[PDB]
Amino acid sequence: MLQDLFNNYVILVGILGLIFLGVNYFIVESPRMDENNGNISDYIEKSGPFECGFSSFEQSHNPIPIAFILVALLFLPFDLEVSSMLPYIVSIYSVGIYGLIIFILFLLILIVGFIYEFNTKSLSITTILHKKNKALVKNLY
Amino acid sequence: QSASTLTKEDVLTRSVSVLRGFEVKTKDIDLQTTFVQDLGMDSLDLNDALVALEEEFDVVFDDKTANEIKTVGEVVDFVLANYLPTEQSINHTIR
Amino acid sequence: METYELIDSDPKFSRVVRYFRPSDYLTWALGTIGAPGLMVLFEKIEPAKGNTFKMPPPSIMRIATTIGFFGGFYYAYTSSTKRFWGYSENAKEVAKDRYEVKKALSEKKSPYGSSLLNPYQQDMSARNSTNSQLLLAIFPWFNVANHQSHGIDLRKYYEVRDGEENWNFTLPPLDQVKDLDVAQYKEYSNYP
Amino acid sequence: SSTHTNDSLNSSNYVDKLKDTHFVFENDKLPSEIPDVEEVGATTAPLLSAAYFIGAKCQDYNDDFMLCQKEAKGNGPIDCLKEGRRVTRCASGVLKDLNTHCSDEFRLHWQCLSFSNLEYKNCRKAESLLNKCVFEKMNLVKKIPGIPEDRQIHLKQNPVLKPVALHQDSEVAFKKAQNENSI
Amino acid sequence: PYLVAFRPAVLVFFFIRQPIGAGLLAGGFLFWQADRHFNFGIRDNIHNFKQTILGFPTQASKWETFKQVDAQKRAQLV
Amino acid sequence: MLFTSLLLIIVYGSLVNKSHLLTKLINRLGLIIIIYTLLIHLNINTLENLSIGINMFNNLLLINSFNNTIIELILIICILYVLLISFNITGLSIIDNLNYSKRTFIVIVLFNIIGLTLLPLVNDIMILFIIIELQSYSLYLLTAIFNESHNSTKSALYYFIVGSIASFIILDATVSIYDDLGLTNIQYILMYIDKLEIFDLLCLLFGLFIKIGLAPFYSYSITIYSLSPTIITNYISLMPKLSILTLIYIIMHYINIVNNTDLNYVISFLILISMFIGSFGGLNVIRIKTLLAYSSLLNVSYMLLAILSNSNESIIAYIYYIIQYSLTHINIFSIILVISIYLPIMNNMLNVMITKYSPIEYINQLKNLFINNIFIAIALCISIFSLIGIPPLTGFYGKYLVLISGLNNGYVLLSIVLIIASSISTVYYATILKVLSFDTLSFKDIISNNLIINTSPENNNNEIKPEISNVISYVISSLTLIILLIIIQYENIVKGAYLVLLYNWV
Amino acid sequence: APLQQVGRHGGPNKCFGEFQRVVECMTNAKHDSYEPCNNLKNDYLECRKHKVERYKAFLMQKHAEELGKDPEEIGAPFVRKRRFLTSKTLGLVDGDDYEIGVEKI
Amino acid sequence: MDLILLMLVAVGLNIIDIYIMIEILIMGCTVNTIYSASLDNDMIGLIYSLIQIIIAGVESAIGLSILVNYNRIRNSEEIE
Amino acid sequence: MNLEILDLSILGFYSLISSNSFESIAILVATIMPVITELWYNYSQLFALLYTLIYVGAVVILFVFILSVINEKEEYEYEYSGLFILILVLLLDDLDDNESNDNDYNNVYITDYADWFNNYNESDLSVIGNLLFTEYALLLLIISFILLMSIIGLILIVKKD
Ligand SMILES: CCCCCCCCCCCCCCCCCC(=O)OC[C@H](COP(=O)(O)OCCN)OC(=O)CCCCCCCCCCCCCCCCC
Ligand SMILES: CCCCCCCCCCCCCCCCCC(=O)OC[C@H](COP(=O)(O)OCCN)OC(=O)CCCCCCCCCCCCCCCCC
Ligand SMILES: CCCCCCCCCCCCCCCCCC(=O)OC[C@H](COP(=O)(O)OCCN)OC(=O)CCCCCCCCCCCCCCCCC
């Protein structure tokens, strides 16, 4: 297997991406040819953030609560499970029945974690607010 | 970590410095110096001083305390009892 | 050291269960009902809540029996294994084992039995499962393959012992018994 | 398998640059005490086309050379020089015969392999003509050991896997033998 | 093989953002490439100094052992 | 038994409804599982059969008589720990419900027990890395089991980072050995014990020394043990040392084949520093768990002297010391949990804050225990006098056997230092005893209607209601008398230690 | 006995034979000490790293330098670029110096 | 330059930066294992390398979860 | 001209000047990429792709955690450093890059002699799977056991209830 052709393609792809930026930088007319409002670094009304018209509080570095953080964390153990199936893909014939049973027992252990997640309802989106109806009771004397 | 490091003398020393940045009648300020009489502060002048003292010690006088405080010593006592350091991020403490 | 004759260094799962003594089933049954009994015993010693006895819920009793059922079987499995290893008195097991092996030899069949595993996998399976009963309390692992690494010599099954003359078993040479390493590599030395 | 090694050519020159690979030549021949031999000059395609004919003709010399290797106890390359030369001459003789008796059929087969990724399943028509010609002129028959005679894949009538693109020279030659040889 | 495609973009963006900082790193990178390509032996001398000062067996130390053996063996023969 | 029953408990716990009663009953199920595991292990594993050493699972694991003894000890000590969460420790819901709040408590313990038992059995560098992470990860989860506690989560964060660095060092050592030799099985590596860099095994021990709080890496262990809840500190401060020290002894057994004197000096240097920090560190402290953390560091140093010597007397010394220290460790923490019922209730200076996780957090909270409960106070006094080394308690014989191995192998400096460290550490040990009893005669005529136990309602005013539950009080009574009356059966127990062989044979 | 030094195709690699002979010597009962197996251990470590052979090459290069011998007169010819393994270098009768095709096999 | 502990400056001043440092350090051991296994033509070392990648991934998940809950506790009033 | 040296020098320069947490996770990406590319050539293409498959997924999960924790601390905190001292530090580290002091092992090249005995040729991944599922199946099962522990461990740490 020779990969010199592949290397040339990867080199071209990297150069190709810079061409799009270089072309756009050399094709656009200069600001003086346009309305001549100066450089973008000074046009603060343009370089500012977009908030649908009305400026609001600047919360760039405020914390962002995530309601699917547990699903994000559970992705990593399951990603490793899928990755660990790669060795069996190309060695299925040589391992024979012995490897097939080992491969099933491997999945029979991870299915316990899959069952545990189902019962614990850990995949559901967490919410701060809860909507509960309150029964109206009269304290008649 | 999260504990007060103030002293009665340091709080009084910085309280006097803040109050000397205004047009007070007398520059001799102690614990028993009254705002209304000794310093000659009216309604709005007194509230300007209280907010200025709030900025120095990063404290907030409540409505009842601010509407009844008479002397500088009461301001010093309030700062000592109520001041707390602002909570830092997780990285500042454990790192 | 109380030592006895070695029968099988890696006995098969079916062989271990078949060679269960009546006491082995008795210990299996005691393990099955002991775990629910211990929950009753623990409540009697000290109630879970309050000061008076309260029977544990049937849902606890069902899962406790399942735990005890596997716990009893593992205890019985270990007891039967020691007879194959020779660590325990196994005169009953030796006589039964020798009869089965001689019968298989007389039929020109391997005592270990035919296997779906190639020569490498049979050896590999034996390495994984041999002496795994020492950790059976930690996690299970059983010999469920027909491999040929049992730490014994089939020559010792040719000599006639007391009480075996009336068995009338004719034993052909090992090189004529199917599914044996000494009777497979006929054409090629690297292929059975 | 395209794993990089230190024993052959790697995938790209960037691998050579990282390894600082030097492709080293030796200008010295074998010492005169070792008798000289004529090396086989067939490339990959002719060798794959004649693989089963070399095995049939030179089976005893192939086994003897390989039995020498196993019985040498690690000294195979040096001790088995004599057995190695027997295999080289015997293999060369098979290729020489193929160029004198079945040259048209032989060249049709390995040129098909070069046309079809060197896969045996894609050149059954050319191989069948070659197999028939070799048997009728050299008494050599392709045989796949370990399976019954009628269950050989090269003799299968309706294989599940067939070449995507037909080889035109193979198709024309196959039709020229169907009508003529089998009247 | 991803660094092959990424390298032109990061290098160009490095000089555009920090031309002086990139110049020092690139200049330092090229100087040590010239030293190795032209066999000036600057890096070799530093490596020899480090091995000598840390007690490592050096190139000269290994060669002196051969000279001592060669002198000894020659005297034994003669 | 452990693995199969663990899966059943995992599924069952997630199916039934969430309640304190079901969790407690599930904890009792875990107690039965460990008891069944002990019975199965004792049925198949014997000291005589395992003397030679038997390979398992393609030689990835190797069990001998030395390894088997620790596994039996691990199962037994785990049984005594589960009794804390499987039964009442104080009888009060406000205190005891913490143990029943987390359902995965018993699950995580069963995960760690599997790691603890298999760690001394490792025979390959690959499985060594796998098992050490299996044990380490289970400890992080147990440290973070109370995820609503700021200190518990902070400690687990500290525990994870320090242990991960130690795991990297362990992985770095094993990889360096593979680079030199190309082999992963320890027995194969032993063939080249004279041709591999023996200091790479010292790198391996450095990672293991971090995981046991050895100096200079002591600081994180003291901080974690003090911040963690008493029920959690009782486990994480003892269980990791049961398995890692046993593995260190095996590794040091292999290292002594080449007998690298430079290797011994480096380990001696760390032992010397650990005795200094272990003794002087606890002199000025006010927390009881902080005091015990320094006590743990000092005692590990004493065991490491036996491990470093690595002779026939070292096997006797280490096996005895680890068994008796574990029993003393359980006894002390069992008493600490119980005596929380005698704490006075406020009804302030220093603004002392006490949480439900650690009701007993300061040494002076043990005041007037001689009056509050004379039998419990004496039981604590016996345990403390054992840590001091007063004969004929179990603690004296542990130090007596350690000194024998140290002086026989020529560690004169360490033996003298360990005895000076013992005298220095006696100062803070005696402080516990001073708090318990030295004010008995002045506070005998005192009135305490504000204690925590006083809030417990009576049944009928005629029932004799014991202040302590049956199980925890019986365990304290049994452990206290075993420590006290070891002289009765000391000779036979050492004879049992005579038969524990690590490839000695003859 | 677990498998060690397994080649990229499932069989023994170059240095398994050296490792196998070490194991056989160490586990053989006839030996009283491990001294007879010492030479076998060196061969296995030489198979992997070739440290002694590299040292021998270091001496030969250093020895030739003091004698004034040119490296290209006593060394072996080599080519650094794979595309320049031309048929002229390979010695073909009609060999040309044009570069060979290594882009796509 | 390593003996003066220069790497202690290359690590950032955040808790997650310590996590990144550990992943890089463990990754260095795996790269070394691949380097030795590839030269030796030993698939056992590549088995070790694969295990180190899987195990290190498990370590990252556990550490992140502790750090996630630690950050949750401070911002846990949630009165709104 | 080894361009790997230049890439690592740029990466090392930003490691000493990285201030916020976003620049730290960018350092991690700027570390795996040289590892993957240097693995893709030379030693092992298989693990270069395996590193990309597994670590890139971990990077995204790492990144999404940063968005929930950033608290303005490093957006206004000052750093002093100095351009001259930073270059001096990197220059001195550049002086010594010999990880081993066996000069013969580093300066003398070796070759291997290929053989035709392996008529059954397959990828390294198939051989890894052959041994992992047969010879070291216990390691594979314990790894799944560890994965099971992580799944339970993540839920108990993170979930409020
Ligand atoms: C091109 C430049 C390359 C420079 C590379 C080094 C960068 C600067 C680092 C400073 C050098 C210190 C480290 C030197 C190597 C480690 C020490 C060592 O291994 O010995 C080497 C040196 C000479 O060894 P030599 O006896 O000549 O030969 C060996 C014969 N068997 O023996 C020595 O005497 C070296 C000096 C060691 C003694 C002083 C240091 C110890 C005392 C101060 C400790 C301060 C830190 C304490 C930290 C303790 C933490 C537990
Ligand atoms: C006849 C019966 C005899 C029984 C006793 C026998 C031993 C007697 C020991 C005599 C030495 C201690 C007595 C004198 C020390 C007095 C300490 C002191 O005065 O202050 C502490 C001193 C700093 O001085 P300062 O705090 O400013 O006090 C004002 C002084 N004008 O702090 C210092 O500068 C001290 C030096 C720094 C600390 C050095 C610690 C190194 C180790 C010391 C030995 C410990 C050995 C422990 C071995 C087991 C643990 C490994
Ligand atoms: C791949 C092609 C397209 C991307 C090209 C972008 C080139 C920028 C530099 C790429 C990274 C090179 C190695 C540097 C490590 C990361 C350091 C960093 O934070 O990014 C550098 C960027 C420069 O801006 P500067 O103001 O100087 O830095 C902040 C000073 N307080 O400061 C920034 O924070 C801006 C970050 C923008 C987003 C960059 C995300 C990482 C990109 C990695 C992809 C390339 C992989 C690494 C390749 C080089 C490896 C050395």
The bridge status of strand D23-24 relative to strand G78-79 is antiparallel
Q: Which residue of G has its CA nearest to I117?
A: G11
Rg of the Cα atoms in chain C = 22
The 3-state secondary structure of F197-247, one letter per residue:
CHHHHHHHHHHHHHHCCCCCCHHHHHHHHHHCCHHHHHHHCCHHHHHHHHH
Question: Which candidate in A91, A92, A94, A98 is best for mutational testing of the C interface (most C CBs within 10 A)?
Answer: A98
Render the burial of C62-91: b for 16+ CB within 10 Å, e for the rest. ebbbebbbbbbbbbbbbbbbbbbbbbeebe
Secondary structure (3-state) at C54: coil
Sequence-ordered alpha helix ranges (H) in E1-78: 2-17, 19-37, 42-53, 59-77
DSSP string covering C92-114: HHHHHHHHHHHHHHHTT--SS--
DSSP per-residue letters across D94-128: HHHHHHHTSHHHHHHHHHHHHHTTT-GGG-HHHHH
Asked if I127's CB is within 8 angstroms of G57's CB, the reply is no
Q: What does the H/E/C string look like for A84-104?
A: CCHHHHHCHHHHHHHHHHHHH
What is the distance between the alpha carbons of residues F325 and C173, in angstroms, rounded to a whole number?
62
- Angle formed at CA F353 by CA F347 and CA F359, multiple of 5 degrees: 90
Question: Which residue's CA is the nearest one to ligand 1's atom 28?
Answer: E55
CB of E17 closer than 6 angstroms to any ligand 3 atom = yes
Count CA atoms closer than 13 A to F390's CA, side-chain side. 13
Q: What does each C-alpha distance from F115 to C137, F55, F120, F134, H65 come to in angstroms?
A: 13, 18, 9, 6, 21
Q: Resolution limit in angstroms?
A: 2.8
Q: Please, what's the b/e burial string for H22-58 (b: 16 or more CB within 10 A of its CB; e: otherwise)?
A: bbbbbbbbbbbbbbbbbbbbbbbbbbbbbbbbbbbbb
Ligand 1 centroid – CA E56 distance (Å) = 12
Give F169 Cα–ligand 1 centroid separation in angstroms: 22
**Which ligand lies nearest the alpha carbon of F283?**
2
Distance from C-alpha of F246 to C-alpha of F131, rounded to nearest angstrom: 14
Which ligand number lies closest to the CA of residue H5?
A: 1
CA-wise closest residue to H18 among H49, H64, H51: H64
Give the distance (Å) from ligand 2 centre to CA of residue C10: 65
Lookup: tokens for B17: 């410095």
Give the ligand at the shortest distance from the Cα of I7.
Answer: 3
Residue D23, strand partner residues: G79
Tokens of E70: 């060669």
Backbone angles phi, psi at F344, to 5 degrees: -65, 155
Interface test with G, best of I43, I103, I106, I108 (most G CBs within 10 A): I108
| Cβ within 8 Å of residue F25, ≥6 positions away | C39, C48, C56, C57, C60
Q: How far is CA F414 from the centre of its chain?
A: 23
Half-sphere exposure of I150 (CA within 13 A, CB side): 30
Positive or negative, the Cα torsion across H39, H45, H51, H55?
A: negative
Question: Cα–Cα distances in Å, from F210 out to C192, F82, F229, F268, F436?
Answer: 53, 27, 22, 16, 34
Handedness of CA F196, F198, F199, F200 (dihedral sign): positive
CB pair distance less than 8 Å for C121 and I137: no
CB of F276 closer than 6 A to ligand 2?
A: yes
Q: Which of F192, F204, F214 is nearest to F132 (CA)?
A: F204
Rounded to the nearest angstrom, the minimum Cα separation between E67 and chain A is 48
Instruction: Output the six-digit token pair for B45.
Output: 């002048």
Residue of chain H minimizing CA distance to G9: H43
Cβ contact H10–I16 (<8 Å): yes
Q: Among G1, F36, A103, which residue's Cα sits nearest to residue C130?
A: G1
Residue B48 known to be catalytic: no
CB C38 within 8 A of CB F4: no
Strands D23-24 and F54-56: unpaired
> How far is residue B87's CA from residue B58's CA, in Å, rounded to a whole number?
13
Name the closest residue on chain B to residue H69, using Cα atoms: B90
Q: Could you tell me if F78 and F91 are in contact, meaning their C-beta atoms sit under 8 angstroms apart?
A: no
Q: Whose CA is nearest to atom 20 of ligand 1?
A: E54
Q: Tell me how close the Cα of E30 comes to any Cα of chain A, in angstroms.
A: 22
The full length of chain F comes to 506
Q: Show residues of chain I in contact with H14, CB under 8 Å.
A: 20-21, 24, 74
DSSP F385-450: HHHHT-TTSHHHHHHHHHHHHHHHTT-HHHHHHHHHHHHHHHHHHHHHHHHHHTTHHHHTT-----
H45 chain-I contacts, CB cut-off 8 A: none
Neighbours of chain B (3+ CB pairs under 8 A): F, H, I
Strands (E), D35-152: none
Interface contact H29-F148, CB threshold 8 A: no
Tell if the CB–CB gap between B87 and H18 is shorter than 8 Å: no
Cα–Cα separations (whole angstroms), residue I54 to A76, I43, I57: 9, 19, 6
Only one residue has tokens 């597994």, namely I54
Q: Which residues 19-78 of chain H have a CB within 8 Å of chain D? A: 38-39, 41
E50 CA from centroid of ligand 1 (Å): 11
Decide if I49 touches D, using CB distance below 8 A.
no
Structural biology method used: cryo-EM
The CB of E74 under 6 Å from ligand 3? The reply is no
SS3 category, F344: strand
Cα–Cα dist D133/F454, whole Å: 109
Whole-number Å distance between alpha carbons of F30 and F83:
10
Q: Which of B10, B42, B48, B58 is catalytic?
A: B42
Q: Whose CA is nearest to atom 26 of ligand 3?
A: E17
Q: Which of B4, B88, B94, B95 to mutate to test the interface with F (most CBs of F within 10 A)?
A: B94
Distance (angstroms) between ligand 3 centre and the Cα of H52 equals: 28
